[PDB]
């Protein structure tokens, strides 16, 4: 018999195809309380949902929630939030790519509420041909101040 078990890994883990390895609980000889150590070999690019496989277990790789990237197959999207001001006058933040490198983001021109920037070959690797990566997309999400004061309104001209 085969039972499904979910295995939350991280985008970074899947990216490098790390030899993630953990122990899982089961029964044993004549009813018991065990914990057996298993070894999973991830592969650069593995998409969640993939599965690698006494008793029998069916493992389904699962993408943990990354604090900066939202994945799209082979593409990676990063949503850089922006203060109202820096949304029309410019900004000079800095972001960390999926592989540790830090990337300088910067404008001196207003940016459209959902305007994006695509960086080729800077996303997750492609499972089939891994020597190829998808690409990073950085989305600017401008933040509006709630109710605005008198000066504010008057100024808007």
């Amino acid at each position: 018999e085969t039972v499904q078990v979910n295995l939350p890994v991280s985008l970074e883990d899947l990216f490098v195809g790390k030899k993630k390895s953990f122990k899982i609980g089961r029964k044993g000889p004549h009813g018991a309380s065990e914990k057996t150590q298993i070894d999973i070999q991830l592969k650069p690019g593995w998409k969640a949902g993939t599965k690698i496989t006494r008793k029998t277990l069916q493992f389904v790789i699962q993408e943990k929630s990354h604090p900066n990237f939202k994945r799209d197959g082979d593409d990676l999207i990063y949503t850089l939030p922006l203060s109202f001001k820096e949304s029309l006058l410019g900004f000079s933040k800095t972001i960390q790519t999926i592989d540790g490198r830090t990337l300088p983001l910067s404008r001196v021109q207003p940016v459209q509420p959902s305007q994006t920037s695509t960086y080729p070959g800077q996303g997750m690797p492609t499972p089939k041909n891994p020597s190829q990566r998808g690409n990073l997309i950085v989305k600017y999400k401008v933040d509006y101040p709630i109710s605005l004061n008198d000066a504010q309104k008057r100024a808007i001209d």
Binding site: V3, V5, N6, L7, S21, F22, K23, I24, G25, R26, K35, Q37, L57
Partner: peptide
């Protein structure tokens, strides 16, 4: 529901 244990 088994017991997942990372490593």
């Amino acid at each position: 529901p088994t017991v997942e244990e990372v490593d």
